[PDB]
Write an enzyme that holds these catalytic residues in place. Structure first.
Site, PDB file in Angstrom:
ATOM      1  N   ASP A 115      33.329  43.094  46.953  1.00 12.99           N
ATOM      2  CA  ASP A 115      33.365  42.012  45.976  1.00 12.99           C
ATOM      3  C   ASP A 115      34.059  40.787  46.557  1.00 12.99           C
ATOM      4  O   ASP A 115      35.044  40.908  47.289  1.00 12.99           O
ATOM      5  CB  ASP A 115      34.065  42.448  44.689  1.00 12.99           C
ATOM      6  CG  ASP A 115      33.983  41.398  43.602  1.00 12.99           C
ATOM      7  OD1 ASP A 115      32.866  41.128  43.110  1.00 12.99           O
ATOM      8  OD2 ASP A 115      35.035  40.838  43.230  1.00 12.99           O
ATOM      9  N   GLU A 139      35.701  36.869  45.580  1.00 13.85           N
ATOM     10  CA  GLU A 139      36.043  35.756  44.706  1.00 13.85           C
ATOM     11  C   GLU A 139      35.801  34.465  45.477  1.00 13.85           C
ATOM     12  O   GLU A 139      35.971  34.424  46.697  1.00 13.85           O
ATOM     13  CB  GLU A 139      37.493  35.838  44.213  1.00 13.85           C
ATOM     14  CG  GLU A 139      37.853  37.120  43.450  1.00 13.85           C
ATOM     15  CD  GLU A 139      36.883  37.467  42.324  1.00 13.85           C
ATOM     16  OE1 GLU A 139      36.369  36.552  41.647  1.00 13.85           O
ATOM     17  OE2 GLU A 139      36.643  38.670  42.108  1.00 13.85           O
ATOM     18  N   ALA A 140      35.388  33.419  44.764  1.00 12.60           N
ATOM     19  CA  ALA A 140      35.070  32.140  45.391  1.00 12.60           C
ATOM     20  C   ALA A 140      35.455  30.944  44.522  1.00 12.60           C
ATOM     21  O   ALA A 140      35.917  31.108  43.389  1.00 12.60           O
ATOM     22  CB  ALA A 140      33.591  32.087  45.764  1.00 12.60           C
ATOM     23  N   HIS A 192      37.578  39.924  37.512  1.00 15.28           N
ATOM     24  CA  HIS A 192      37.454  38.720  38.344  1.00 15.28           C
ATOM     25  C   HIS A 192      38.518  38.620  39.447  1.00 15.28           C
ATOM     26  O   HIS A 192      38.862  37.529  39.903  1.00 15.28           O
ATOM     27  CB  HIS A 192      37.382  37.454  37.478  1.00 15.28           C
ATOM     28  CG  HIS A 192      36.439  37.574  36.321  1.00 15.28           C
ATOM     29  ND1 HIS A 192      35.074  37.678  36.480  1.00 15.28           N
ATOM     30  CD2 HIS A 192      36.666  37.625  34.987  1.00 15.28           C
ATOM     31  CE1 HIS A 192      34.500  37.779  35.295  1.00 15.28           C
ATOM     32  NE2 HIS A 192      35.443  37.749  34.372  1.00 15.28           N
ATOM     33  N   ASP A 198      37.457  44.279  40.676  1.00 17.18           N
ATOM     34  CA  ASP A 198      36.006  44.372  40.504  1.00 17.18           C
ATOM     35  C   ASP A 198      35.367  45.443  41.388  1.00 17.18           C
ATOM     36  O   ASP A 198      34.361  46.043  41.008  1.00 17.18           O
ATOM     37  CB  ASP A 198      35.347  43.015  40.756  1.00 17.18           C
ATOM     38  CG  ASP A 198      35.728  41.972  39.716  1.00 17.18           C
ATOM     39  OD1 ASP A 198      36.373  42.326  38.703  1.00 17.18           O
ATOM     40  OD2 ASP A 198      35.374  40.791  39.912  1.00 17.18           O
TER      41      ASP A 198
HETATM   42  C1  LIG Z   1      31.721  34.981  36.079  1.00 18.90           C
HETATM   43  C2  LIG Z   1      31.959  33.665  36.778  1.00 18.90           C
HETATM   44  C3  LIG Z   1      32.150  33.627  38.156  1.00 18.90           C
HETATM   45  N1  LIG Z   1      32.359  32.451  38.778  1.00 18.90           N
HETATM   46  C4  LIG Z   1      32.570  32.407  40.238  1.00 18.90           C
HETATM   47  C5  LIG Z   1      34.066  32.510  40.527  1.00 18.90           C
HETATM   48  C6  LIG Z   1      34.249  33.900  41.103  1.00 18.90           C
HETATM   49  O1  LIG Z   1      35.266  33.905  42.103  1.00 18.90           O
HETATM   50  C7  LIG Z   1      32.886  34.240  41.685  1.00 18.90           C
HETATM   51  C8  LIG Z   1      32.587  35.738  41.658  1.00 18.90           C
HETATM   52  O2  LIG Z   1      32.374  36.197  40.322  1.00 18.90           O
HETATM   53  P1  LIG Z   1      33.239  37.413  39.710  1.00 18.90           P
HETATM   54  O3  LIG Z   1      34.624  36.884  39.427  1.00 18.90           O
HETATM   55  O4  LIG Z   1      32.452  37.960  38.542  1.00 18.90           O
HETATM   56  O5  LIG Z   1      33.348  38.482  40.729  1.00 18.90           O
HETATM   57  O6  LIG Z   1      31.932  33.501  40.913  1.00 18.90           O
HETATM   58  C9  LIG Z   1      32.393  31.241  38.028  1.00 18.90           C
HETATM   59  O7  LIG Z   1      32.592  30.148  38.605  1.00 18.90           O
HETATM   60  N2  LIG Z   1      32.212  31.240  36.697  1.00 18.90           N
HETATM   61  C10 LIG Z   1      31.996  32.380  36.026  1.00 18.90           C
HETATM   62  O8  LIG Z   1      31.831  32.353  34.787  1.00 18.90           O
HETATM   63 NA    NA Z   2      31.471  39.671  41.679  1.00 19.44          NA
HETATM   64 ZN   LIG Z   3      34.896  39.628  41.457  1.00 12.08          ZN
END
Ligand SMILES: Cc1cn([C@H]2C[C@H](O)[C@@H](COP(=O)(O)O)O2)c(=O)[nH]c1=O
Ligand code: NA
Ligand SMILES: [Zn+2]
Ligand SMILES: Cc1cn([C@H]2C[C@H](O)[C@@H](COP(=O)(O)O)O2)c(=O)[nH]c1=O
Ligand code: NA
Ligand SMILES: [Zn+2]
Lengths: 217, 217
Positions: free
Chosen positions: A10, A12-13, A178, A183
């Site tokens: 997984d 994060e970005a 998140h 995750d």
């Molecule tokens: C679910 C979601 C993720 N993201 C971006 C930031 C997270 O670091 C990346 C990975 O998604 P995640 O946190 O579901 O694993 O996608 C958003 O910008 N807005 C959102 O609503």
């Molecule tokens: Na993800």
């Molecule tokens: Zn994540």
């Protein structure tokens, strides 16, 4: 029964695909085929949340991005570029590629990356970040698979977000949402629901990571 | 203050120092200096178990040993040579040294390893393992400190096992005892009790890891 290692992954970005995001956190969870096989097949309604395997390789790393995180991404992940940099986090660089290579080298081959929504997010982003680097990609030779497409086949034999599936199967809210490691552990639990049927599907549908097109650039 | 990174460390092994043990599992939890300082000073009687800092680098790895685990070791750790081998775990080799080095390089320097009973077990054993390798030691240039000596100086300003100290402070039994990751997280929780006084003591008593004598050989 060829895939010897499944690496639950997984990222994060800084934001969504359209913003051209940069990785802020990564987690890799290497689990040998036999550890998933010997996880109990879920019984009851709802079944209890499965225990993770004892023998596990874990890598979790915070990475400082070049661009700032979006307000929405910072809110959900708990990470910001400012806080990452003031705590001395390094960029997605060549040393990180060496780190990942050595981690992957310790796992019995063939290997397969497992990521939720990997085909549209995690895999192409990681391909983009590794494309920037001078040293060749450490993920060449490794396979990848999307757990959404996996669970879609296992369930059919409305939301498919990581949280929604976890709450449907176990009637419990996921913990540490998140966050890269949180995750990954949530992903592991969902994959431990029908792990023999999951492993058979991975074998048939896993594609080489080198076939994955980059998100951008 | 000068120690920018504290790396919380724990090893699992085949047995006690008398049996000349080999490492079966290791965990490194890298926490930046500021992440410890910005933890709330455990208030309450008893205080709640603090959440780990958000920004954290973690590495947990299982290692196949050259010799079998003692009966008592396999019982508490939940690991065995056969199980590590059958799950394709590799030995303490040069690739592992590269992995450790690349992990440590991502951390702002100077670094200090923190381990429970580290001076009598963890550090000498790890020194013995790295001495077998052809590649130079990745822990050369890093510092190390024992958390028992840390807590004894902070508390005094009867059982000093990781479980006994944790139960006195939080009134709860530790989770995942005698596992590398579980014991590191337990150690991290204990070190978050008085982090500013802890870091002050670390900067005073941190010795180079190169001065640590090997357990055997
Ligand atoms: C679910 C979601 C993720 N993201 C971006 C930031 C997270 O670091 C990346 C990975 O998604 P995640 O946190 O579901 O694993 O996608 C958003 O910008 N807005 C959102 O609503
Ligand atoms: Na993800
Ligand atoms: Zn994540
Ligand atoms: C506490 C204890 C540890 N050990 C060995 C095996 C463990 O992998 C290693 C590290 O101890 P630990 O599990 O407390 O961290 O020391 C024993 O053999 N017997 C014991 O009673
Ligand atoms: Na220990
Ligand atoms: Zn331990």
């Amino acid at each position: 029964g060829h895939m010897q290692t499944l690496i639950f992954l997984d990222l994060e970005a800084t934001g969504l695909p359209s913003s051209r995001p940069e990785v802020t956190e990564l987690c890799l969870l290497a689990v040998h085929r036999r550890a998933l096989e010997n996880t109990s097949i879920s019984q009851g309604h709802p079944p209890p949340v499965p225990r993770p395997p004892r023998v596990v390789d874990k890598l979790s790393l915070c990475i400082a991005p070049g661009k700032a995180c979006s307000p929405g991404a910072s809110e959900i992940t708990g990470l910001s570029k400012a806080e990452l940099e003031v705590q001395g986090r390094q960029r997605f660089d060549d040393n990180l590629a060496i780190l990942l290579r050595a981690f992957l080298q310790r796992q019995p081959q063939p290997c397969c990356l497992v990521a939720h929504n990997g085909d549209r997010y995690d895999f192409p982003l990681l391909q983009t970040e590794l494309a920037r680097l001078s040293t060749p990609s450490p993920l060449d030779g490794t396979f990848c698979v999307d757990s959404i497409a996996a669970l879609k086949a296992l369930e059919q034999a409305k939301s498919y977000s990581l949280g929604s599936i976890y709450t449907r199967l176990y009637w419990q809210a996921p913990t540490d949402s998140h966050t890269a490691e949180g995750d990954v552990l949530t992903l592991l639990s969902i994959c431990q629901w029908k792990p023999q049927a999951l492993l058979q599907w991975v074998d048939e549908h896993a594609r080489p990571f080198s076939t994955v097109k980059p998100m951008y650039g």
